[PDB]
Amino acid sequence: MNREQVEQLKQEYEEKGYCQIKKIFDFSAIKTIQKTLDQAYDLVKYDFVSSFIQEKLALLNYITGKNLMIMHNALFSVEPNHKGLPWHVGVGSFSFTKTEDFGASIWIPLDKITKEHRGGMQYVSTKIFPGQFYYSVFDLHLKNNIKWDESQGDLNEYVANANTIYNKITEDVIDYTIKDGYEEDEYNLGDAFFFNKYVLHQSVPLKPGLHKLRRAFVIRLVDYDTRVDEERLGLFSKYSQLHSRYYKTLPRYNKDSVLVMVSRAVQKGLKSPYLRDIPHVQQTLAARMAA
Amino acid sequence: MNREQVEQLKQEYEEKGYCQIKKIFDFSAIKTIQKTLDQAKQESQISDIDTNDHAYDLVKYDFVSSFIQEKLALLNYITGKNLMIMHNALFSVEPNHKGLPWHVGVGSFSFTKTEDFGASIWIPLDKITKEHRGGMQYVSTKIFPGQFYYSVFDLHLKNNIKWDESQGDLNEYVANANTIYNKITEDVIDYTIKDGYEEDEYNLGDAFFFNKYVLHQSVPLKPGLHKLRRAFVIRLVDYDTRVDEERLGLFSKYSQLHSRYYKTLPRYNKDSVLVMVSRAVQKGLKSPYLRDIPHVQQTLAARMAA
Ligand SMILES: O=C(O)CCC(=O)C(=O)O
Ligand SMILES: [Cl-]
Ligand SMILES: [Fe+3]
Numbered sequence: 001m002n003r004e005q006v007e008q009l010k011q012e013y014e015e016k017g018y019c020q021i022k023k024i025f026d027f028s029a030i031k032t033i034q035k036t037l038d039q040a041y042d043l044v045k046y047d048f049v050s051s052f053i054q055e056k057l058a059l060l061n062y063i064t065g066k067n068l069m070i071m072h073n074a075l076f077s078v079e080p081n082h083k084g085l086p087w088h089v090g091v092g093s094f095s096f097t098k099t100e101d102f103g104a105s106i107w108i109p110l111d112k113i114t115k116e117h118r119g120g121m122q123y124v125s126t127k128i129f130p131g132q133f134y135y136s137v138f139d140l141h142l143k144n145n146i147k148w149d150e151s152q153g154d155l156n157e158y159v160a161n162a163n164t165i166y167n168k169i170t171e172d173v174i175d176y177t178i179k180d181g182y183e184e185d186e187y188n189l190g191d192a193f194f195f196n197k198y199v200l201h202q203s204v205p206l207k208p209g210l211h212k213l214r215r216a217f218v219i220r221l222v223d224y225d226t227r228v229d230e231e232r233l234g235l236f237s238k239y240s241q242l243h244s245r246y247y248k249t250l251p252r253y254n255k256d257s258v259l260v261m262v263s264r265a266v267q268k269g270l271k272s273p274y275l276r277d278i279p280h281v282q283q284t285l286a287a288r289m290a291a
Numbered sequence: 292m293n294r295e296q297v298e299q300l301k302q303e304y305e306e307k308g309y310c311q312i313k314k315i316f317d318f319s320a321i322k323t324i325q326k327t328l329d330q331a332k333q334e335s336q337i338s339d340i341d342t343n344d345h346a347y348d349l350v351k352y353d354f355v356s357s358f359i360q361e362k363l364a365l366l367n368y369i370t371g372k373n374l375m376i377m378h379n380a381l382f383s384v385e386p387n388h389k390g391l392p393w394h395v396g397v398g399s400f401s402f403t404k405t406e407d408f409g410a411s412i413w414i415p416l417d418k419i420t421k422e423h424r425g426g427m428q429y430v431s432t433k434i435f436p437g438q439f440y441y442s443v444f445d446l447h448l449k450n451n452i453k454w455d456e457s458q459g460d461l462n463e464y465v466a467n468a469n470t471i472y473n474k475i476t477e478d479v480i481d482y483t484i485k486d487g488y489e490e491d492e493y494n495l496g497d498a499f500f501f502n503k504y505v506l507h508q509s510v511p512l513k514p515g516l517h518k519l520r521r522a523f524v525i526r527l528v529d530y531d532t533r534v535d536e537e538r539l540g541l542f543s544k545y546s547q548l549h550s551r552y553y554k555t556l557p558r559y560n561k562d563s564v565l566v567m568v569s570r571a572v573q574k575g576l577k578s579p580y581l582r583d584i585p586h587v588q589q590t591l592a593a594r595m596a597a
């Protein structure tokens with residue numbers, strides 16, 4: 001890659017907590033991947049992406065000053081007239097990590113992103129919105145969640161109506177906070193968006209013209225020294241009991257395979273705080289990291 | 292001290308981010324503080340806060356070390372940090388006033404980096420009783436980890452500073468702005484903390500020690516015991532604590548904006564810490580550390596344990 005550009009991405013990431021990476025991928029590679037798609041198990045279901053990603057870790061490692069390690073490849077596709085989540089920071093996506101420890105993502109659009117037919121992603125520099133504090137707010141919310149009992153009526157409603165700092169930060173309050181100081185960009189194939197977990201962001205809806213759907217890979221990474229958060233996992237388990245005991249069913253986050261994976265390792269007892277030392281991660285280590 | 296007590300103190304601070312320390316000052320020290328602050332207070336004119344006295348740096352670092360330096364060892368041990376005396380404040384409340392509302396030390400420790408260490412010793416100069424109260428309430432950082440509140444407050448400050456003549460009265464603009472800061476009302480705090488706060492009785496000689504992420508407020512003083520209740524507060528940082536030029540600039544700009552609109556003239560006690568730091572910064576800093584400020588570096592020995 002153009003060494004001057006690389007130096008600029010490193011500067012930009014250091015400024016905003018994110019950078020758009022133009023031509024990070026060969027068209028070929030995108031078509032390969034795109035073509036293969038056209039062809040407990042959700043954990044590895046897309047590991048064939050890993051190799052494509054692994055070739056780029058050195059770059060990203062340089063850009064961020066971290067030693068990155070792939071956790072999970074998710075395919076995120078959805079119809080054009082789709083209501084997504086409002087600006088958020090991924091307190092859920094990275095619930096398995098210590099808040100202060102490092103986490104980041106690569107958003108890989110499989111279908112072009114145009115000025116028309118937006119259909120991509122908006123994002124706010126962490127200079128403007130240092131997303132870290134949002135994680136603490138969320139944790140306060142989780143702890144309030146597990147205060148519920150039957151005496152207080154419907155569980156989900158209790159949660160939705162609880163007067164918690166989290167619930168207070170409504171879409172308008174966020175909109176008012178960021179105003180127009182966000183970016184949205186155009187993406188040709190083989191372009192990706194890289195952002196750490198403190199970057200407030202949101203998906204934009206797609207115009208009907210083209211294409212059929214908006215397809216993108218989303219890859220979660222952490223750092224070699226990124227630790228688990230046992231207490232948060234405690235919170236989720238405790239909430240999962242209340243939930244099944246009452247709705248006779250499980251919360252939908254048991255569908256996050258990384259969460260499930262990390263939780264089991266934890267319950268089974270953890271010699272170490274590092275995610276790298278979780279047996280399933282450790283076994284596939286070299287595949288998860290830079291050459 | 293006892294040794295067994297000292298270990299409970301350490302233990303409590305580790306859990307809650309605070310600890311009440313009973314009988315740490317002797318009555319004589321207290322009387323000295325009273326008299327000295329009473330004199331300093333008479334001399335100068337000072338301007339949802341419902342407090343009588345809100346004076347910063349009425350006395351200097353040397354008067355402070357004179358009764359604090361011999362205690363830094365206990366505090367260093369409790370926090371596992373190396374503490375430097377920095378700035379101070381005197382607060383007082385009359386009966387039936389709310390004093391300060393819930394807050395964390397984002398105002399007090401404004402010119403330092405959020406993640407760097409800051410703590411306070413709150414020394415009541417009038418007895419706090421179960422019957423008349425007028426003390427403080429405080430919340431374990433286990434219940435309310437106050438560090439997040441700093442960003443929230445910084446976002447709000449940044450909005451303050453976008454004010455415009457078009458907007459109308461500055462104070463009203465600030466108070467009604469739809470910022471996250473403004474959303475966190477007393478009701479919200481109440482709902483967040485519940486009954487998890489603690490309120491303790493204090494005899495002269497007792498003090499409250501707390502780091503800057505602890506959420507705390509004044510309690511109303513019931514009439515019939517004291518005409519006024521005073522508390523003297525010492526702010527401490529770590530040897531390695533750094534200046535935050537960015538927040539310092541926000542505060543200056545907002546202060547500037549406020550004085551310009553209201554035609555007020557902010558007075559600072561000579562050798563106010565804030566002023567001292569603002570100059571060093573305005574000159575340009577050689578080092579990030581507070582210790583490497585020239586006035587500090589010169590007076591460092593008095594500021595630290597023996
Ligand atoms: O003395 C009071 O009522 C409040 C003091 C305070 O907020 C502090 O010492 O940080
Ligand atoms: Cl404070
Ligand atoms: Fe997201």
Ligand SMILES: [Fe+3]
Nearest residue numbers: 394395396507
């Ligand atoms: Fe305070």
